[PDB]
Design a protein around this nucleic acid. Structure first.
Ligand SMILES: [Zn+2]
Ligand SMILES: [Zn+2]
Lengths: 62, 115, 905
RNA sequence: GUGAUUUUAAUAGCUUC
RNA sequence: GAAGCUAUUAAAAU
């Protein structure tokens, strides 16, 4: 629905980060948790894509 | 009852080690002082523990609580020994400042020894 | 000329408040008991002429001259009584004159509002209509008028500063109490008999009505102060009126009292406080509840202790330890307990010199927190406002919650079947929310909403008797260790017993004889234990973290062996108010709804929630629920055994040490979810709150308007039974229980309720309503019931709006119409789209998950909305697909799912 | 590290009609 | 086929 897809990809990406074990960095874990929770709670699809790209930047950094 | 034997050996060990780790000197000089030899439990570490652990959430609380290399709490003096962040990494006393505060992984934990 | 008369020797500038000589009419609260009407409600006062006082600046002040017109008899009578009582400094000045010949009694320098007005405002709070409360707070410098411009200024959860705004009235309330005691001493000395009412004491502390007082011989006068004190009690802790007792002398401009740390008794201090503030309370107060006479005395003596315990240092409470020797080796163990509610309790079986500890004594000494605390390091935690005892470890542990696992195959199937499209009514709103490392301490800090609450004792003592009637159809008592049933033996045993095994290890290593010995030991001693806070990894629609408490096995065994008989009886009974144990399948939902509808005359339905239920439960209400549960042990136990069981329960679940991240904290109170009787005690609490709401609603109505003579006499006898008889009236308790069952039918399951009530009586103010519930929860639970989470349904064809997260539809099954519990489609779909383990992503070996989920969704196929039937049919096609590629047919046929709701015939 | 209690389904055994 | 019992896995509710 262009929204549930984003909400599922955010869950998948956070699971990928957890498996990669970014929880060692408390700062990074807190930022990723905040972004994922905000994406899940979002009502509009506009800011959801922005926050999804922000979260994906964390994975792309490594 | 090989289960019973093992669990019995376990609890016994624990108790005796905590007993050896008891601060005999200070514990005794306060328990007998009591009129009937009975004291509240909450004051035992407050008047006998030789190590203090302080968990500070931000820098404002740091400055209000642990300003300097020594501080007073529970009517005693405490000498700061080691400061550690939330990642179990040693933090120096020269890094805790307003300018460097956002670059630290809060909360920090301060370990102090009694005077 | 009336102006100058009222002026009198103490000349002052007087502002006529009304039309000069005409009496001012006001809407004020009165405490009433006549032969024609009774109750604490608001009436019209039309026999007083007010004259506000000015000053040099000609601006008004909080001073009034109240002139009353009455008969010549009351003139001579009230002149004699005031001449007798004139010496008392706590009596307002009176002027007795008569000039047109009509007698007038002028009271001087009175305030606008009285203690009755303050008590009514704080006990019948209605947001949007708190004008009297706002005016009082502005008048007495509690806050500014700009404080009310902010929204949600009144509730304790969003605005914690209202506690400081309310506590600004404590000194005034304390002065009123002192003046009341002075007035009582003066009455006794002068030999006068009369009742003390809040509406005769202005907000300075003076008393001004003597029309009903009687004169007798000097030295022997009797002031009656039960209603006064009992109604005033809920505000003594809301305004924190006894904060001045913690300073040197009793003034707020001096430093705090520095108590000795090694002091724990405070019995003489409690007796002194009682004698200072409640001198003429005619019931015996036991500072230590171990000397009480029954459970109705324990509550009365603990209500005073909750108020008196706020004066003493917080470090004087908890376990009391001593140094014993094991074969010449010193050993520190717990020997008593100082309770905030029960006083000081000492164990009856303590041996200083002992040897050769057995399994049971080893278990008790390992579960005892004293050795842990005495070995740990001192801890100062600034992340929370809870008391911190010690750090058992040498570092702090942080716990994080993992994300959920995505069921991509099921999501692709749903998308390919036409689901999850823009502009749909069905969307995913339930997920697994991840938490950072501070979630545990952040959720533990939510115990800050628990505050010490003193409660009306005369109303609570009647409410407990009424509530006890809802638990008359059950069997209780103690059982032997071989009669105990443990559902899951592979659960955690708690701290520190989780380092060696599960509960199965203890239950196997401990024989029946050992377990019976431990149970017998708990009846003469107190065993404090440690609860552990764990994070629950579940699905939800909110980003809040879920936390549960792991009670120790030492507490769990005893509690089971003490309570399972009654718990099982409750869970097995069908057709009662508490519906724990009833299934919604095979017509259970229909049966429960028919039972709750019963035969109410003008039926309407209603539901409410409990904001912060577990974190804000008053200790007095928790103790009351425990005593109600324990009331079934009249044969198997004595008073000492029952008291020691109650003390053990309080010290184990109510307020104990809590391990959170390797550190020991002190729980302020509330309820520990994970205790043997959590759901059964929450059902008792809910029934208690409903009953007290009904009582307040009935007592708050003007008696001169109830056209029903039967209900008017019921109200009269209700006020009589609360505030005039000290012994239980079984006949009136039965009558009130029958009245409630007829007009207020309840379906209770823990903190979730559905009520079928008579609408005409509710509109006439004869039974409880949403506003009555909101007021009750305000002044008792210290929370705010916003009417957004409460619902009302005027049509019973549509069932309750929501009960146990299930909705209701009236559908035709066979040849009759029944009620069906359909769930939230988003919840059902999210249960299958996301899982908690990587194993469950493969549904080929997890067909039972989807079979159960389709069993939960079958009812949606009768919904007028096609997108709901769509979810059920989607669950069915997937079951088939898996059943197929894997390699019976029942899990694809709809018949297997239809017969799970049809009566079992 | 992962509580209390209630209900239900699947699977595999043991007595019974 | 019928009813009851036991163990194992799973789902929902407060
Ligand atoms: Zn008593
Ligand atoms: Zn008993």
């Amino acid at each position: 629905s262009k929204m549930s897809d984003v909400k599922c990809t955010s869950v998948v990406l956070l699971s990928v980060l957890q498996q990669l074990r970014v929880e060692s960095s408390s700062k990074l874990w807190a930022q990723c948790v905040q972004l994922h929770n905000d994406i899940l709670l979002a009502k509009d699809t506009t800011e959801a894509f922005e926050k999804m790209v922000s979260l994906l930047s964390v994975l792309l950094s490594m | 009852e090989d289960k019973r034997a093992k669990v019995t050996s376990a609890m016994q060990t624990m108790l005796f080690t905590m007993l050896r780790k008891l601060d005999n000197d200070a514990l005794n000089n306060i328990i007998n002082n009591a009129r009937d030899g009975c004291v509240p439990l909450n004051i035992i570490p407050l008047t006998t523990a030789a190590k203090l652990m302080v968990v500070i959430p931000d820098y404002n609380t740091y400055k209000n609580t642990c300003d300097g290399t020594t501080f007073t709490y529970a009517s005693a003096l405490w000498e700061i020994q080691q400061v550690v962040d939330a990642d179990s990494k040693i933090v120096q006393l020269s890094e805790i400042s307003m300018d460097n505060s956002p670059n630290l992984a809060w909360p920090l934990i301060v370990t102090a020894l009694r005077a | 000329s009336f102006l100058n008369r009222v002026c009198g020797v103490s000349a002052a500038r007087l502002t006529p408040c009304g039309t000069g000589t005409s009496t001012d009419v006001v809407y004020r609260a009165f405490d009433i008991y006549n032969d024609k009407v009774a109750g604490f409600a608001k009436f019209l006062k039309t026999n007083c002429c007010r004259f506000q006082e000015k000053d040099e600046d000609d601006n008004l002040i909080d001073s009034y001259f109240v002139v009353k017109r009455h008969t010549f008899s009351n003139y001579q009578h009230e002149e004699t009584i005031y001449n007798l009582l004139k010496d008392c400094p706590a009596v307002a000045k009176h002027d007795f004159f008569k000039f047109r010949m009509v007698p007038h009694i002028s009271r001087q320098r009175l305030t606008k509002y009285t203690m009755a007005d303050l008590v009514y405002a704080l006990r019948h709070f209605d947001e949007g209509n708190c004008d009297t409360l706002k005016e009082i707070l502005v008048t007495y410098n509690c806050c500014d008028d700009d404080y009310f411009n902010k929204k949600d200024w009144y509730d304790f959860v969003e605005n914690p500063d209202i506690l400081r705004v309310y506590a600004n009235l404590g000194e005034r309330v304390r002065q009123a109490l002192l003046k009341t005691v002075q007035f009582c001493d003066a009455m006794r000395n002068a030999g006068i008999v009369g009742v003390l009412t809040l509406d005769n004491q202005d907000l300075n502390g003076n008393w001004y009505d003597f029309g009903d007082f009687i004169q007798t011989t000097p030295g022997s006068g009797v002031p009656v102060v039960d209603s006064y004190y009992s109604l005033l009690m809920p505000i003594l802790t809301l305004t924190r009126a006894l904060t001045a007792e913690s300073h040197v002398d009793t003034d707020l401009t001096k430093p705090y009292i520095k108590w000795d740390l090694l002091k724990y008794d405070f019995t003489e201090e409690r007796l002194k406080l009682f004698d200072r503030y409640f001198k003429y309370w005619d019931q015996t107060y036991h500072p230590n509840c171990v000397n009480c006479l029954d459970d109705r005395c324990i509550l009365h003596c603990a209500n005073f202790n909750v108020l008196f315990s706020t004066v003493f240092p917080p470090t004087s409470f908890g376990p009391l330890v001593r140094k014993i020797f094991v074969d010449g080796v010193p050993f520190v163990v717990s020997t008593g307990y100082h309770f905030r509610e029960l006083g000081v309790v000492h164990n009856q079986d303590v041996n200083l010199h002992s040897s050769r500890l057995s399994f049971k004594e080893l278990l008790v000494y390992a579960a005892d927190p004293a050795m842990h605390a005495a070995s740990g390091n001192l801890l100062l935690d600034k992340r929370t406002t809870c008391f911190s005892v010690a750090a058992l470890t040498n570092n702090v542990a942080f716990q994080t919650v993992k994300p959920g696992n995505f069921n991509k195959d099921f999501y692709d199937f749903a998308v390919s079947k036409g689901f999850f499209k823009e502009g749909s009514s069905v969307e995913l709103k339930h997920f697994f929310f991840a938490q950072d490392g501070n979630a545990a301490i952040s959720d533990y800090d939510y115990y800050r909403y628990n505050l010490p609450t003193m409660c009306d004792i005369r109303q609570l003592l009647f409410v407990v008797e009424v509530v006890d009637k809802y638990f008359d159809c059950y069997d209780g008592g103690c059982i032997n260790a071989n009669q105990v049933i443990v559902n899951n033996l592979d659960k955690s045993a708690g701290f520190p017993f989780n380092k060696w095994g599960k509960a199965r290890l203890y239950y196997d290593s401990m024989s029946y004889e050992d377990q019976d010995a431990l149970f017998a030991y708990t009846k003469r001693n107190v065993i404090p234990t440690i609860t552990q806070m764990n994070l629950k990894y579940a699905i939800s629609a909110k980003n809040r973290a879920r936390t549960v408490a792991g009670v120790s096995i030492c507490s769990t065994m005893t509690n089971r062996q003490f309570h399972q008989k009654l718990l099982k009886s409750i869970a097995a009974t069908r057709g009662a108010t508490v519906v724990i144990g009833t299934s919604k399948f095979y017509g259970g939902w229909h049966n429960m709804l028919k039972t709750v509808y019963s035969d109410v005359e003008n039926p309407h339905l209603m539901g409410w929630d409990y904001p912060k239920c577990d974190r804000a439960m008053p200790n007095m209400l928790r103790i009351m629920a425990s005593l109600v549960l324990a009331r079934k042990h009249t044969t198997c136990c004595s008073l000492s055994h029952r008291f020691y069981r109650l003390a053990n329960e309080c010290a184990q679940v109510l307020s104990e040490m809590v391990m959170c991240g390797g550190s020991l904290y002190v729980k302020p109170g509330g309820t520990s979810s994970g205790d043997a009787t959590t759901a059964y005690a929450n059902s008792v609490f809910n029934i208690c709150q409903a009953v007290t709401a009904n009582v307040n609603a009935l007592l708050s109505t003007d008696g001169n308007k109830i056209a029903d003579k039967y209900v008017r006499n019921l109200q009269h006898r209700l006020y009589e039974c609360l505030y005039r008889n000290r012994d239980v009236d079984t006949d009136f308790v039965n009558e009130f229980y029958a009245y409630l069952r007829k007009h207020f039918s309840m379906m209770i399951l823990a903190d979730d309720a559905v009520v079928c009530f008579n609408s005409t009586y509710a509109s006439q103010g004869l039974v409880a309503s949403i506003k009555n519930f909101k007021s009750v929860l305000y002044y008792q639970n210290n929370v705010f019931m916003s009417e957004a989470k409460c619902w009302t349904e005027t049509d019973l064809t549509k069932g309750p709006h929501e009960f146990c997260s299930q909705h209701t539809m009236l559908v035709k099954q066979g040849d009759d119409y029944v009620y069906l519990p359909y769930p939230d489609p988003s919840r059902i779909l999210g249960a299958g789209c996301f899982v908690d383990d990587i194993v469950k992503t493969d549904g080929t070996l997890m067909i039972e998950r989807f079979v159960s989920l389709a069993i939960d969704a079958y009812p949606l196929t009768k919904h007028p909305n096609q997108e709901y039937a769509d979810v059920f049919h989607l669950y069915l096609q997937y079951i088939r697909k898996l059943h197929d590629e894997l390699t019976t047919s029942r899990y694809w046929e709809p018949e297997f799912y239809e017969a799970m709701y049809t009566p079992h015939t």
